[PDB]
Design a protein around this nucleic acid. Structure first.
Lengths: 113, 127, 100, 98, 150
RNA sequence: CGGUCCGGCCGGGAACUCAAAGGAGACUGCCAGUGAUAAACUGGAGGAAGGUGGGGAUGACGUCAAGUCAUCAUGGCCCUUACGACCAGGGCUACACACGUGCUACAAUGGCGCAUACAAAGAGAAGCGACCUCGCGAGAGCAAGCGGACCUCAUAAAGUGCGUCGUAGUCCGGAUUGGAGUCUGCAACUCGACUCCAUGAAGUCGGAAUCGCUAGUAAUCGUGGAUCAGAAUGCCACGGUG
RNA sequence: ACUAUGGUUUUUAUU
C-alpha cells in the first residue's frame, strides 16, 4: 500500500492519490500505468517493490517532484522594471495577459464589503 | 375475410390487417416483444385488443414506418380500431365508450412567428 | 451616409477589380514553407494592404436602395421597409403571403 | 450524359412549362418518365414590422419553388431544342447540365 | 350505452398492495424524468426491512395511518366577510398528502439520498414521530380552538 | 404480381404514405333538462371533428402632459475660416459601485467510466469536403463523392444497460496559474476564437420580495441558418422527453 | 356586525 499514492485510501480506484500530484494528472498517470503494463479498472493492481518505482524514467520528460517549479522560480525573476508591462505585472499581483476591471472582476478583486 | 385499417399520427403511418383464425400478433415481420421492451408507449396498442379478448381467436398483421415510438403506437392503436370496427360494427358502440375511435387532441401546428419556441411568456418582471 | 460615399463606392470597386478580385486564388497558394534556405514570398505579402481605403472587410455588401452596411437581406439587396412594399409589387419571383 | 431541370415560382406555371417537354418526350423513345415530381423547396423569412422596437409585432414571408426533372430519355437534337423556346416564361428557370 | 362512466384511468398492481402508487412516484419528479422518481419501488423498503425491524408488508400502510391529515383551516368567503373555517380533507387526498409532506429535514439528515432517505423518515412516521408531526397536531388544534358551524 | 438461400434491390405498382395543389363536412342541424318552450349553461347521438373543435391574422369613438427631426420629410436655433467637408492617427470592452435580464452550478431529481436506440430543418461554384495521415491538440496535408431528395457538413442528446462515489467544499466543482502553439485580420499592448500538459480558490438551494402554466402547459435535451475576414450564450427555424 | 391588523395623501413650483 502507498507505493506511489501518498494518501491512506489504498482499496479504491486508480485515480485516487495518482492524479493532480507532483506534475502528474490523468494523461501522465495513464503514461506510467502504460509503462508498467498493469491493470486499472475498479482498482489499481496490487504491486511490490522493483515493479513501477523502477519505471519513473519512462515519464521523466516533464517538470516533476523537486523540479516542478525549481528553475522557473528563478527565470520568472528576470523582468522586474516598472516601465516594463511584464515587469510591473510580475512585481505586483496583476494579470500579464490583461483582464477587465470595471465589471465581472470580483474573483481577482475578491469579496466586496 | 381480411378486414383492413389505416392509421397515421405525427409523421408516422401504419397499416393493419385483422382476420379470424389463430390468436397471433406480428409487427414489421418481428414479434410484438422482439425489439420493444423499454419504450414508454409500447403497451398502448393493447388497449382495444382486450375488448374482444386477446390472442385466442383473431389474427393481427401490422406494418409501420416514419416518426417516433409514441407516434407509431398512437397510429397503430387507431389503425387497429379502424380494422376492428369492420370486423364487427357493434364494437363501434364499445370503442366510443373508451375513446379509441377518435383522433386524439394533440397534433403538430405551424411555427408561431419569431420569439424562440413562441409558446412561453417573455420577461415581464417589474424590477 | 456621407455624400462622398457614392463617389467612394465606384473608387473602391474599381480598385478591387484591379487588385483583390485578380489576386485571391494566388494569395491562397503562396503559403509555402518548402523552398531550401530563405523564404520566397515573405517580401510580397504586403500587397494585401498596399492600396488605401480599398479592402474586402471595408467593402461590405451594403443595402441597394438605402446607404447602409447593416439591417439588410442579401437575397433581395433590400431592408425590411423596402421588402414590405416589394412583397406587394413583385416582380420579385414567388414572394407572397401564400394564397397563390 | 446530359441533364435537364425545370423550376418555377408558381404551382400552375410549373405545368405550363412541363406541358411542352412531356409531349416532346412522346416524340422520341418508347417509354416516358412523366413529370418526375421531386420535393418542392420553401424559402422563408421572419422580419420586424413596427417603425421602432415593439417586440410583440413580428411578420413572416415565404417563397416556394416547384421543380420537375422529366428526363429527355434519348439522344435527339429536336428534343433538347424544346427547351430553347421555353425559359422566357415569367417565373421560369431552365438549367441544362453536361 | 356508449358514453358512460368512464372507467379505469389507472389500474391496481398485484405486487405493490397500494393504489397510492400513481401519486407516490409523482414525488421529486422533474422535466418528466419519471424513472428518477420511480427509483424507490422494490429498493427503499427492501432497505427499510434491513434498517428498522423485519418485513415491509404493512410499514408504508401503517406509517400513513399514523401520519393522517383529516382537517384543513382556511379563510373562506360568506360575502363580504371571509371567516376562518375548518374543512375536512377531501376523500381522494386524505391518505395521498402526507407522503409528499416530509421535506423540512431532507437536506439536513445526511441520509445519503433518495432510497436511503425514505428508509429513515418512515421509521419516525411509523410512530407519528420526527418531521412535520408537531405541525399536524398544530392543525388539529387550529381546528379545535375554532370548529365554526358544524 | 414476376426475378427471389427470398433485398424497394431489379422489373413493376402507387395500394399506404410523403411533396403537394384543386376542393369537401357542420346548419344549433338533432335530442333531454334548467332557464323566461327566448338566449345561454350542462349533458348526449351522429362524425375524424361542433355549441370559440386545437392554433393565428385585430387596433371603432375616446385616452396618455406616450415614443420619432433616426423610415421619410422639413420650419426654427446654432455653427458658417466653422460645430461644414476632406486627410491620418485615435475612442466606442478607458473604473470606482448598485444592478435588469441570462448561465455553468452548488451535487446523487447528479457525476465519472464504458457501450447504445429513436430525428427534422437548412448550408454547400478557390463550395460541403469523405477515406486515410501528421501534429499531444487547435488545425492542417493528400484527394474521392456531389453541384447536390442521392455525396459531403453529419457518431442527435436527454434517455437505456453494467460498474463506481459512502454525503464531505468531495473521485465534486474549476474563477486561477505557468510554458508553448493552431486560425484570422493593416490591427489580438489596450481589445479576438481555439488547444496541449500541469496548476488552483469559491460554490452548501439564495434577505424582504418578484415572476410562470391550467396540459403537449410551467420545466428540459439535441441540430441548423443569417449578419460575417476572425468573433455570439442575442436573433430566426427545426426535432426529441414530460 | 368578525381575512386580527399599514401611518397619509410634503413646504410648494408656474410653457
Amino acid at each position: 500500500a502507498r507505493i506511489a499514492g501518498i494518501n491512506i485510501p489504498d482499496h479504491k480506484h486508480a485515480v485516487i492519490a495518482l492524479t493532480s500530484i507532483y506534475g502528474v494528472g490523468k494523461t501522465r498517470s495513464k503514461a506510467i500505468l502504460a509503462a508498467a503494463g498493469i491493470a486499472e479498472d475498479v482498482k489499481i493492481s496490487e504491486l511490490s517493490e522493483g515493479q513501477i518505482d523502477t519505471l519513473r524514467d519512462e515519464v521523466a520528460k516533464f517538470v516533476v517532484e523537486g523540479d516542478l517549479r525549481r528553475e522557473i522560480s528563478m527565470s520568472i525573476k528576470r523582468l522586474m522594471d516598472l516601465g516594463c508591462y511584464r515587469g510591473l505585472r510580475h512585481r505586483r499581483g496583476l494579470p500579464v495577459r490583461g483582464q477587465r476591471t470595471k465589471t465581472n472582476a470580483r474573483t481577482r478583486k475578491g469579496p466586496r464589503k | 375475410n381480411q378486414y383492413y385499417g389505416t392509421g397515421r399520427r405525427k409523421s408516422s403511418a401504419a397499416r393493419v390487417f385483422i382476420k379470424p383464425g389463430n390468436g397471433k400478433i406480428v409487427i414489421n415481420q418481428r414479434s410484438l416483444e422482439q425489439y420493444f421492451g423499454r419504450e414508454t408507449a409500447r403497451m398502448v396498442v393493447r388497449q382495444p385488443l382486450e375488448l374482444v379478448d386477446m390472442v385466442e381467436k383473431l389474427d393481427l398483421y401490422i406494418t409501420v414506418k416514419g416518426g417516433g415510438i409514441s407516434g407509431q403506437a398512437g397510429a397503430i392503436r387507431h389503425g387497429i380500431t379502424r380494422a376492428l370496427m369492420e370486423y364487427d360494427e357493434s364494437l363501434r358502440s364499445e370503442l366510443r365508450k373508451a375513446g379509441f375511435v377518435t383522433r386524439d387532441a394533440r397534433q403538430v401546428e405551424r411555427k408561431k412567428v419569431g420569439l424562440r419556441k413562441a409558446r412561453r411568456r417573455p420577461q415581464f418582471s417589474k424590477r | 451616409a456621407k455624400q462622398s460615399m457614392k463617389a467612394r463606392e465606384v473608387k473602391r470597386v474599381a480598385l478591387a477589380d484591379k487588385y483583390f478580385a485578380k489576386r485571391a486564388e494566388l494569395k491562397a497558394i503562396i503559403s509555402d514553407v518548402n523552398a531550401s534556405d530563405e523564404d520566397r514570398w515573405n517580401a510580397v505579402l504586403k500587397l494585401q494592404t498596399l492600396p488605401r481605403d480599398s479592402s474586402p472587410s471595408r467593402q461590405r455588401n451594403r443595402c441597394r436602395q438605402t446607404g447602409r452596411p447593416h439591417g439588410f437581406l442579401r437575397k433581395f439587396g433590400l431592408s425590411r421597409i423596402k421588402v414590405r412594399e416589394a412583397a406587394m409589387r413583385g416582380e420579385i419571383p414567388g414572394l407572397k403571403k401564400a394564397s397563390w | 450524359r446530359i441533364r435537364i431541370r425545370l423550376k418555377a415560382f408558381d404551382h400552375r406555371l410549373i405545368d405550363q412549362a412541363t406541358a411542352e417537354i412531356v409531349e416532346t418526350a412522346k416524340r422520341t423513345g418508347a417509354q416516358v418518365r412523366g413529370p418526375i415530381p421531386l420535393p418542392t423547396r420553401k424559402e422563408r423569412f421572419t422580419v420586424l414590422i413596427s417603425p421602432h422596437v415593439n417586440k410583440d409585432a413580428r411578420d413572416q414571408y415565404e417563397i416556394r419553388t416547384h421543380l420537375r426533372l422529366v428526363d429527355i430519355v434519348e439522344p435527339t437534337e429536336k428534343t433538347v431544342d424544346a427547351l430553347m423556346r421555353l425559359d422566357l416564361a415569367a417565373g421560369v428557370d431552365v438549367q441544362i447540365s453536361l | 350505452r356508449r358514453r358512460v362512466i368512464g372507467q379505469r384511468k389507472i389500474l391496481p398492481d398485484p405486487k405493490f398492495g397500494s393504489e397510492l402508487l400513481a401519486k407516490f412516484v409523482n414525488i421529486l419528479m422533474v422535466d418528466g424524468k419519471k424513472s428518477t422518481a420511480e427509483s424507490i419501488v422494490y429498493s427503499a423498503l427492501e432497505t427499510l426491512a434491513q434498517r428498522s425491524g423485519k418485513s415491509e408488508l404493512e410499514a408504508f400502510e401503517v406509517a400513513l395511518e399514523n401520519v393522517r391529515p383529516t382537517v384543513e383551516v382556511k379563510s373562506r368567503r360568506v360575502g363580504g366577510s371571509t371567516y376562518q373555517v375548518p374543512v375536512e380533507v377531501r376523500p381522494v387526498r386524505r391518505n395521498a398528502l402526507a407522503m409528499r409532506w416530509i421535506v423540512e429535514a431532507a437536506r439536513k439528515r445526511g441520509d445519503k439520498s433518495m432510497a436511503l432517505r425514505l428508509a429513515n423518515e418512515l421509521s419516525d412516521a411509523a410512530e407519528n414521530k420526527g418531521t412535520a408531526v408537531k405541525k399536524r397536531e398544530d392543525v388539529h388544534r387550529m381546528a379545535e380552538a375554532n370548529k365554526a358551524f358544524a
